[PDB]
């Protein structure tokens, strides 16, 4: 709200939020599965669950925290404007946290790791079939691939053992996430 007041027309909100902590689906940790001192005495950040019309289905999301516009109530959580980018480090313990931060710091500082992507001038390289100036747009293109957190347990197991975001979306940055589209 403060920013919007003086922000110039067209400019997007520059602020970002980092939820530095894991989140539990049962926020109050009252269910039977949560009754266990580690799980109990740990502090988590909250989780928001986008409940739909008449508790039919529901999805857990952090996008809720970035819905800062003054849109009317008729617009459901799914159709509102994502004003602020939100990110999360689903870490429970400081050991977990240090590993995340060390990984993020070392990424920016290892300048030599960034030159490996530029070194690919010798030619899991998959070709994307889509529909001088035309080839320039494809050099700037990129593909993000979603990680699909499964259903590893026979119904009741998942509910007793997969209690937090960390348990569900396995944290340790896994499988081919970002593809750069390269042209000769």
């Amino acid at each position: 709200d403060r920013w919007k007041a003086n922000a110039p027309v067209g400019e997007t909100f520059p602020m970002q939020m980092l939820l530095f902590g894991d989140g539990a689906h049962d926020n109050r940790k009252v269910s039977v599965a949560w009754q266990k001192p580690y799980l109990q005495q740990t502090e988590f950040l909250l989780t928001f669950q986008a409940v739909n019309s008449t508790n039919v289905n529901s999805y857990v999301t952090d996008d809720y925290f970035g819905l800062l516009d003054d849109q009317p109530a008729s617009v459901n959580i799914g159709w509102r404007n994502y004003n602020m980018a939100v990110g999360r480090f689903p870490v429970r313990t400081p050991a977990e946290a240090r590993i995340a931060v060390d990984k993020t710091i070392r990424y920016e500082e290892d300048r030599e790791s960034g030159a490996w992507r530029i070194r690919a001038c010798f030619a899991m390289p998959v070709r994307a079939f889509q529909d001088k100036k035309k080839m320039l747009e494809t050099l700037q293109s990129g593909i993000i691939l979603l990680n699909y957190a499964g259903h590893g347990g026979p119904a009741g197991w998942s509910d007793e053992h997969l209690l937090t975001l960390n348990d569900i979306h396995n944290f340790n940055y896994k499988h081919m996430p970002i593809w750069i589209t390269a042209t000769c």
């Binding site: 300048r111 030599e112 030159a115 070194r119």
Partner: peptide
């Protein structure tokens, strides 16, 4: 040959092999 350039005014980094 590893190369790393730094533009003092823009603080921008260039690199080559």
């Amino acid at each position: 040959i590893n190369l790393y350039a730094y533009n003092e005014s823009t603080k921008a980094e260039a690199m080559g092999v």
